[PDB]
Amino acid sequence: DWVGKWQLREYQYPDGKVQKVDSIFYGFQKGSFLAYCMNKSGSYEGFYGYYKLKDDEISITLWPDNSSGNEAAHEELVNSASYKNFFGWGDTGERTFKVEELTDKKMRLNYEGTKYVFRKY
Numbered sequence: 001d002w003v004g005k006w007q008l009r010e011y012q013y014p015d016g017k018v019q020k021v022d023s024i025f026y027g028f029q030k031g032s033f034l035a036y037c038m039n040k041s042g043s044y045e046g047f048y049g050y051y052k053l054k055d056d057e058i059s060i061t062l063w064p065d066n067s068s069g070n071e072a073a074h075e076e077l078v079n080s081a082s083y084k085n086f087f088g089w090g091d092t093g094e095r096t097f098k099v100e101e102l103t104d105k106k107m108r109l110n111y112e113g114t115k116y117v118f119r120k121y
Contacts, residue, residue, distance in 0.1 A: 002051075004068040006107055006118040014113035024086070025121065033060055037086050045082055049093075058109070069099040 006026045011019035027034030028051065035047040049062040062077065063072035077083055078093045091096040097116065101108035109116035 001102060001104075002053075003030070004028065005034075005121040007118050007121045010115060010117045012115035012117060026118065033062075033087070037082070045086075047083075047086070056099050057096055058099055059094065059096045062089070064085070065094075066092065 004027070006023045006028070008024040008026065011017075013019070013121050023038040025036045025038070027036070031050055031052075033049040033051045037045045039045075045058055047062060049060060049065075051061070052059045062074045062083075065075065066074045074093060076078075078089075078091050083089075083093075087093075089096070095111060097109035099108075100110050100115070105120050107116075107118040107120070109118070
């Protein structure tokens with residue numbers, strides 16, 4: 001029920017604020033994670049990783065992770081402006097969300113009060 005591309009429609013910050021998003025997509029495929037930032041140009045930037053489902057949570061980890069053999073490439077990724085603007089998940093390159101909604105069309109994730117509102121594409 002996670003498979004496919006999911007367009008991030010908006011951010012809902014705790015205190016009430018709403019941020020319209022059009023360029024962002026999340027992809028889910030049998031444990032693998034994909035994410036892309038568009039440009040009306042005709043080009044897009046992509047990211048990849050894996051996810052784990054536990055109770056009512058999804059743990060998204062970006063590849064390369066921060067293992068001993070990956071730290072150099074991990075640090076090149078988590079320090080890039082692209083990652084800071086798109087994810088902002090910090091040095092770890094991992095974020096665990098509460099799954100508030102998941103249907104055949106909508107998906108709503110929650111992180112420390114910030115709601116991630118997606119529509120299936």
